[PDB]
Amino acid sequence: GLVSACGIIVGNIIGSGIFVSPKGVLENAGSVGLALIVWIVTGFITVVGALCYAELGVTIPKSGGDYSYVKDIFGGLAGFLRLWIAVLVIYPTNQAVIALTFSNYVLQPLFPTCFPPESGLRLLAAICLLLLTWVNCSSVRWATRVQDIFTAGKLLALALIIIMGIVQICKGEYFWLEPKNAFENFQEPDIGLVALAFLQGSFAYGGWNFLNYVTEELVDPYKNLPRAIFISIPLVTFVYVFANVAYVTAMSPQELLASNAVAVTFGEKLLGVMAWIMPISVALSTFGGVNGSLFTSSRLFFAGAREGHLPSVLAMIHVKRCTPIPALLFTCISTLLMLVTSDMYTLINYVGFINYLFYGVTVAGQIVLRWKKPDIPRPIKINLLFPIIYLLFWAFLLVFSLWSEPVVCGIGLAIMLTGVPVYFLGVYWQHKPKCFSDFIELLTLVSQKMCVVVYPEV
Amino acid sequence: TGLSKEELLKVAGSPGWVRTRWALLLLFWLGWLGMLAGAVVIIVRAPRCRELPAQKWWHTGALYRIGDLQAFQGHGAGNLAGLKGRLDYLSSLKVKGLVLGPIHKNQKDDVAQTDLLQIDPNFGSKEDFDSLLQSAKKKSIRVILDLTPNYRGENSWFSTQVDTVATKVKDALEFWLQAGVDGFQVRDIENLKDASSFLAEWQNITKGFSEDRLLIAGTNSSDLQQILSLLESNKDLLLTSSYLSDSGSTGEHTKSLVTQYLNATGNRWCSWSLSQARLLTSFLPAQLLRLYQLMLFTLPGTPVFSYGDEIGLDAAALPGQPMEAPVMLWDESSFPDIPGAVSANMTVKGQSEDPGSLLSLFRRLSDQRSKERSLLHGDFHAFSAGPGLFSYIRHWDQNERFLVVLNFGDVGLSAGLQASDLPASASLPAKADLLLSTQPGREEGSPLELERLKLEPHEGLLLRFPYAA
Ligand SMILES: CCCCCCCCCCCCCCCCCC(=O)OC[C@H](COP(=O)(O)O)OC(=O)CCCCCCCCCCCCCCCCC
Ligand SMILES: CCCCCCCCCCCCCCCCCC(=O)OC[C@H](COP(=O)(O)O)OC(=O)CCCCCCCCCCCCCCCCC
Ligand SMILES: *[C@@H]1O[C@H](CO)[C@@H](O[C@@H]2O[C@H](CO)[C@@H](O)[C@H](O)[C@H]2NC(C)=O)[C@H](O)[C@H]1NC(C)=O
Ligand SMILES: *[C@@H]1O[C@H](CO)[C@@H](O[C@@H]2O[C@H](CO)[C@@H](O)[C@H](O)[C@H]2NC(C)=O)[C@H](O)[C@H]1NC(C)=O
Ligand SMILES: *[C@@H]1O[C@H](CO)[C@@H](O[C@@H]2O[C@H](CO)[C@@H](O)[C@H](O)[C@H]2NC(C)=O)[C@H](O)[C@H]1NC(C)=O
Ligand SMILES: *[C@@H]1O[C@H](CO)[C@@H](O[C@@H]2O[C@H](CO)[C@@H](O)[C@H](O)[C@H]2NC(C)=O)[C@H](O)[C@H]1NC(C)=O
Ligand SMILES: CC(C)C[C@H](N)C(=O)O
Longest dimension (CA), chain A: 78
Q: Which atom of ligand 7 is nearest to the CA of A293?
A: 1
Tell me the CA distances in angstroms from B456 to A286, B364, B414, B463, one per residue in order.
Answer: 55, 21, 8, 16
Residue A221 makes CB contacts below 8 A (sequence gap 6+) with A58, A379
Q: What's the DSSP call for residue A264?
A: H
CA distance A70 to A303: 13
Nearest to B454 by CA among B416, B419, B427: B416
Chain A contact set for B42 (CB, 8 A)? 117, 119-120, 123
State the first-to-last Cα distance of chain B, in angstroms, to the nearest integer. 54
Nearest to B290 by CA among B101, B167, B437: B437
Provide the Cα torsion A120, A121, A122, A124; round to 10°.
80
Quote the distance between the C-alpha of residue B149 and its chain's center.
28
* DSSP states along B266-306: TS---EE-S-SS--SSTTS-SSSTTHHHHHHTSSSSEEEEE
User: How buried is residue A254: exposed, middle or buried, by Cβ count under 10 Å (0-12/13-18/19+)?
Assistant: exposed
Confirm if B199 and B234 have CB atoms less than 8 A apart.
Answer: yes
Confirm if A162 and A15 have CB atoms less than 8 A apart.
Answer: no
Nearest to B141 by CA among B81, B96, B80, B83: B96
Helix axis angle for A386-404 and A194-201, nearest 10°, is: 120
Q: Which atom of ligand 7 is nearest to the CA of A289?
A: 9
Confirm if A355 and A202 have CB atoms less than 8 A apart.
Answer: yes
* Three-class DSSP category at A423: helix
Helix axis angle for A91-106 and A346-371, nearest 10°, is: 150
CA distance A314 to A453: 10
Q: What is the resolution of this structure in A?
A: 2.9
CA distance B240 to A355: 61
Confirm if A287 and A125 have CB atoms less than 8 A apart.
Answer: no
CB contact under 8 A, B39 and A115: no
Three-class SS of A105-158 = HHCCCCCCCCCCCHHHHHHHHHHHHHHHHHHHHCCHHHHHHCCCHHHHHHHHHH
Confirm if B213 and B183 have CB atoms less than 8 A apart.
Answer: yes
Touching B: A residues 432-451, CB under 8 Å = 440-441, 444-445, 448-451
CA distance A310 to B64: 72
CA distance A364 to A362: 5
Distance B55 CA to ligand 3 centre (A): 25
CB atoms under 10 Å from CB of B322, counted, come to 10
Q: What's the gap in Å between the CA of A201 and the closest CA on chain B? A: 27
CA distance A413 to A433: 31
Helix axis angle for B126-138 and B164-179, nearest 10°, is: 60
Q: For chain A, how many residues are written?
A: 458
Q: What is the β-pairing status of strands B142-146 and B183-186?
A: parallel
Residue of A nearest to B3 (CA): A455
**A355 marked as part of a ligand binding site:** yes
CA distance B393 to B383: 8
CA distance A122 to A99: 9
* Three-class DSSP category at B380: strand
Q: Where does A249-311 have alpha helices with state H? A: 253-256, 262-268, 274-295, 299-305
Nearest to A27 by CA among A189, A182, A165: A189
Q: Kindly state the helix (H) or strand (E) to which residue B374 belongs, with its residue range.
A: helix B373-376
CA distance B182 to B96: 11
User: How buried is residue B81: exposed, middle or buried, by Cβ count under 10 Å (0-12/13-18/19+)?
Assistant: middle
> Would the CA dihedral through A354, A360, A362, A364 be positive or negative?
negative
Nearest to B359 by CA among B427, B313, B409: B313
CA distance A365 to A73: 6
Quote the distance between the C-alpha of residue B358 and its chain's center.
17
CB atoms under 10 Å from CB of B395, counted, come to 23
Buried b (16+ CB within 10 A) or exposed e, B326-360: bbbbbebeebeeeeeebeeebbbebbeeeeebbbe
CA distance B172 to A374: 90
Single-letter amino acid code for the residue at B64: Y
User: Start-end ranges of CATH 2.60.40.1180 in chain B?
Assistant: 378-465
Which residues does ligand 1 sit against, CB inside 6 Å? Answer: A 130, 133-134, 137-138, 325, 329, 332-333, 336, 450-452; B 21, 24-25, 27-28, 31, 35
Looking at the structure, give the CATH architecture of the domain made up of residues B378-465: Sandwich (2.60)
Nearest to A97 by CA among A131, A137, A128: A128
Nearest to B49 by CA among A414, A200, A109: A109
* DSSP states along A24-38: HHHHHH-SHHHHHHH
Confirm if B294 and B260 have CB atoms less than 8 A apart.
Answer: no
Confirm if B462 and B393 have CB atoms less than 8 A apart.
Answer: no
Radius of gyration of chain A from Cα atoms? 23
Confirm if A66 and A299 have CB atoms less than 8 A apart.
Answer: no
CA distance A243 to A399: 31
CB atoms under 10 Å from CB of A304, counted, come to 24
One of 1.10.10.60, 1.10.630.10, 1.20.1740.10, 2.30.30.60 is the CATH number of A7-454, namely 1.20.1740.10
CA distance A21 to B180: 42
Which residues does ligand 3 sit against, CB inside 6 Å? Answer: B 200, 204, 208
**A440 marked as part of a ligand binding site:** no
Confirm if B101 and B343 have CB atoms less than 8 A apart.
Answer: no
Confirm if A324 and A298 have CB atoms less than 8 A apart.
Answer: yes
Three-class SS of B2-56 = CCCCHHHHHHHCCCCHHHHCHHHHHHHHHHHHHHHHHHHHHHHCCCCCCCCCCCC
CA distance A294 to A327: 10
Ligand nearest to the CA of B218: 4
CA distance B124 to B80: 6
Confirm if B407 and B389 have CB atoms less than 8 A apart.
Answer: yes
Single-letter amino acid code for the residue at A79: G
Nearest to A316 by CA among A228, A305, A91: A305
Confirm if A324 and A301 have CB atoms less than 8 A apart.
Answer: yes
CB atoms under 10 Å from CB of A326, counted, come to 21
Q: Kindly state the helix (H) or strand (E) to which residue A55 belongs, with its residue range.
A: helix A32-59
CB contact B52 to A (< 8 Å): yes
Confirm if B213 and B207 have CB atoms less than 8 A apart.
Answer: yes
Please state the φ and ψ torsions of residue A378, each to the nearest 5 degrees.
-115, 105
CB contact under 8 A, A450 and B2: no
For the structural domain made of B63-371, what CATH number should be given?
3.20.20.80
Longest dimension (CA), chain B: 117
CA distance A24 to A35: 10
Number of H helices, E strands in chain A: 20, 2
Single-letter amino acid code for the residue at B444: E
CA distance B93 to B304: 13
Q: Where are the beta strands (DSSP E) in A317-434?
A: 317-318
Tell me the CA distances in angstroms from A248 to A185, A245, A278, B55, B265, one per residue in order.
Answer: 15, 6, 17, 22, 40
Tell me the CA distances in angstroms from B266 to A106, A391, B253, B424, one per residue in order.
Answer: 39, 66, 20, 22
Please state the φ and ψ torsions of residue B454, each to the nearest 5 degrees.
-85, 140
* Three-class DSSP category at B399: coil
CA distance B297 to B292: 9
User: Start-end ranges of CATH 3.20.20.80 in chain B?
Assistant: 63-371
Q: Which atom of ligand 2 is nearest to the CA of A311?
A: 24
| Half-sphere exposure at residue B339, Cβ-oriented, CA atoms within 13 angstroms | 0
Please state the φ and ψ torsions of residue B402, each to the nearest 5 degrees.
-135, 150
Confirm if A9 and A214 have CB atoms less than 8 A apart.
Answer: no
CA distance B442 to B323: 37
User: How buried is residue B11: exposed, middle or buried, by Cβ count under 10 Å (0-12/13-18/19+)?
Assistant: exposed
Q: For chain B, how many residues are written?
A: 469
Ligand nearest to the CA of A437: 2
State the first-to-last Cα distance of chain A, in angstroms, to the nearest integer. 31
Tell me the CA distances in angstroms from A182 to A30, A178, A244, B282, B352, one per residue in order.
Answer: 11, 9, 15, 38, 20
Nearest to B27 by CA among B39, B38, B35, B37: B35
CA distance A69 to A300: 13
**Adjacency order of strands within the sheet including B302-306:** B238-240, B214-218, B183-186, B142-146, B97-100, B63-66, B302-306, B271-272
- Please, which experimental method was used? cryo-EM
Quote the distance between the C-alpha of residue B373 and its chain's center.
13
Single-letter amino acid code for the residue at B373: R
> Would the CA dihedral through A376, A378, A384, A386 be positive or negative?
negative
* Three-class DSSP category at B192: coil
